[PDB]
Amino acid sequence: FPATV
Amino acid sequence: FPATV
Amino acid sequence: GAMGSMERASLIQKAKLAEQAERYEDMAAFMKGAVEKGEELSNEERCLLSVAYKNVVGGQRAAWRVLSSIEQKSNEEGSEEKGPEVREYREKVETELQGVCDTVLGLLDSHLIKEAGDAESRVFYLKMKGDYYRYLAEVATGDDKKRIIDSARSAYQEAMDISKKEMPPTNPIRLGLALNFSVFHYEIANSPEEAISLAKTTFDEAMADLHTLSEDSYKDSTLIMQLLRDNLTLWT
Amino acid sequence: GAMGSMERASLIQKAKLAEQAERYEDMAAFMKGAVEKGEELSNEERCLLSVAYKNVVGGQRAAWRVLSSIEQKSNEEGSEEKGPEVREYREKVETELQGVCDTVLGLLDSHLIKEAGDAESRVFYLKMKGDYYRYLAEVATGDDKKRIIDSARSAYQEAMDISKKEMPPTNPIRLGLALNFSVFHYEIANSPEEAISLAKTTFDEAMADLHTLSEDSYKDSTLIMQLLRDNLTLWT
Ligand SMILES: *SCCNC(=O)C(C)(C)Oc1ccc(Cl)cc1
Ligand SMILES: *SCCNC(=O)C(C)(C)Oc1ccc(Cl)cc1
Ligand SMILES: CC(C)Oc1ccc(Cl)c2cc(C(=N)N)sc12
Ligand SMILES: CC(C)Oc1ccc(Cl)c2cc(C(=N)N)sc12
Ligand SMILES: [Mg+2]
Ligand SMILES: [Mg+2]
Ligand SMILES: [Mg+2]
Ligand SMILES: [Mg+2]
Ligand SMILES: [Mg+2]
Ligand SMILES: [Mg+2]
């Protein structure tokens, strides 16, 4: 999964 | 901490 | 509100303790109680609210994905029928996740966003609105799926418009918003090109502004820039 | 019982799904519902019950330790008074932990132990009884602390007596019981010598019985033997 903040 | 199962 | 009788300052203090103890459900409950006092939140308090709910919903999302994968494998050809239980349990987790998202969106709508005038607060809350509609979109399948996706898009777009007018390109909130809206494009809106373009332009514009920053600000901004680069590497 | 309307087999199936999704609170709730159907549990079902509650209470114990450490540091000389909040929140976690322990002890007493006649079931449940009284003892401070410790000791001792008569020295339940009773001696009963002696004798007697085992049984037994050795290394 891609990075999110 | 010591191991327990 | 079960936190109604606790002082605001005590709720904030306990949210910080809950974070140290990795008790994120408690942390979220304390921060909900703090928001419900009706006063605006500080920068640090916004971080506490976001961290708490991000961890709660992140765990729910991870579990939902495990269960949805099992459910998919059980519906393929040749799989043995095992009854309604996988679907039921996936639905249970999904309903709990949707409940948490509804709670966060409810705090944002009543009344965090409408009182948020500074960019650092308003962009932060609009980003959160986009994020929690995005989590609803991840599990949505019904008549309202397109409206859910569009609610996420609209919140992110308003946040982006403000961030570009009111924040420098290295501001970590602006960077994190762009990171997450880019993920929205890629994973939710079926717009991988927009996702890649947004991540690249955000990264490049931040790079060109790093020279203005102190060492500590540089560390903060480059941390999020690396996440943009990580996603670009995944996608190209 | 909120699980009262769900089939036993469905509860077991969902406990297994919850384990895969690392949803241990759900797993514990499903297994509680299964126990409350009133039928005895199989070997595998005993493992599901134990894993679920071990993970729930383990997380509570870890959080309690973090909070109790903060509370201790706040009571030292020179520390700034920060009000009742650390104590309150430690008490909140403690009360939840005690509630989980009471629930497990309640399942064991009503009526798992009294129907458990085979060593593999009875020793397992008596070990669990010792474990959950040990967790209560970790947080106890009142008039009943000695009685709580003695309840743990009594359950472990009965389990040990049966295990030595009815199980080979390499049986993993016998080994795990000895591992945990040894920890009880060291951490709860202030009996480090007994803890060390029990771990050593258990290890040595298991070593001498490994020759009787298949490759797969050997793997199971040596895994727990290494935990005994790990604790001995910590303690010597
Ligand atoms: S506000 C939460 C504290 N900040 C963080 O955890 C990291 C990821 C280091 O920074 C950001 C989080 C959220 C945003 Cl919108 C921007 C930076
Ligand atoms: S019964 C739970 C499944 N077994 C385990 O997780 C390990 C630790 C490998 O084995 C034992 C657990 C509990 C006991 Cl009492 C003995 C072995
Ligand atoms: C991860 C760090 C670098 O991001 C932050 C920036 C600023 C504040 Cl005030 C804050 C409070 C935070 C928390 N209790 N997690 S994190 C955080
Ligand atoms: C960790 C393993 C080697 O210990 C076991 C032995 C025997 C059974 Cl039947 C079983 C079921 C288990 C589970 N769902 N965690 S673990 C487990
Ligand atoms: Mg108050
Ligand atoms: Mg649904
Ligand atoms: Mg644009
Ligand atoms: Mg049934
Ligand atoms: Mg107490
Ligand atoms: Mg003895």
Q: State if residue D63 touches ligand 4 by the CB under 6 angstroms criterion.
A: no
Find the distance separating the first CA and the last CA of chain B, reported in whole Å: 13
Local structure of D126: helix, strand or coil: helix
The experimental resolution of this structure, in angstroms, equals 1.1
Ligand 10 center–CA C220 separation, angstroms: 58
D39 touching C (Cβ < 8 Å): no
C21 CA: distance to closest CA in chain D (Å) = 5
Q: Which of C131, C186, C224 sits opposite A2 (nearest CB)?
A: C186
Torsional sign, CA C1, C4, C8, C10: negative
> How far does Cα D91 stand from its chain's mean position?
21
Could you say which of C63, C67, C85 has the minimum Cβ distance to residue D10?
C85
Q: Do B4 and D224 touch (CB under 8 A)?
A: no
For D112, which DSSP code?
I
* d(C-alpha D61, C-alpha D81), whole Å: 25
For residue D185, give every residue at least 6 positions away whose Cβ sits within 8 Å of its Cβ, in sequence order, or none. D191, D192, D194, D195, D198
The span from the CA of D186 to the CA of D183, in Å, is: 5
Distance between CA C52 and CA C31 in Å, rounded? 8
Sign of CA dihedral C40, C41, C46, C51: negative
The fold for domain C8-235 equals Delta-Endotoxin; domain 1 (1.20.190)
Q: Which amino acid is at D17?
A: L
Contact residues, chain C, for D81 at CB < 8 Å = none
CB pairs under 8 A between C and D: 56
Atom of ligand 3 nearest to the CA of C43: 9
Q: Is C100 on the interface with D (CB under 8 A)?
A: no
